[PDB]
Amino acid sequence: MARLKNLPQERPLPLASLIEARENQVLSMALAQSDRVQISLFSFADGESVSEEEYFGDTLYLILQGEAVITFDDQKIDLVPEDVLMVPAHKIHAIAGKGRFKMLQITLID
Template identity: 45%
Template sequence: MEFLRNLPTDDPAALAGLIDIRPGRVVSMALTRSEHCQMTLLAFGDGESVSEERYFGDTLYYVLEGSMPLRTEMGERILAAGQCLAMPTGVSHAIGGAGPFKLLQITVQ
């Protein structure tokens, strides 16, 4: 495959099962090879977070397991498993800092 990687090609699998939560770490797995679309699986250990960031394109967060705190200038939101939220290009935000969770992050330019 030219653009997708680290994904099952023979048998279907749950996205959440492709990455493991590790205590004290943020684990990531890139699912694409493209400068215009980045898809990444992320697994956050209990209390782990990513500080404020701004992305090059619109970003979609889809929570696979657990619940994900997302902080913006307008306050904090908690996304539960199965929920998603989009952040526009250039909007500063931070994620994590609570219990363990897994998510799919897609950024499109």
């Protein structure tokens, strides 16, 4: 079964408050158990993660806190809190922090 998880149901909280940010560690939390959609919170700093990724489905990134940079093909795109960017299926890309940051990722597995 598809289900949302790890989110408040009785007292609302800011989404950024659900994950810490660390200088030297990468943190992640799944917000869905689903075969059709992956929804995750992530935090890291600088290039502590920074793998090149290429997903089979479309992805939206939402910056919750801090600044980040996304790289693909021709461009470095800078992001600040509240920015959203959609990266289409099969677009090779990488994301890195400009310092510490927190983001929400939604990816279609499709």
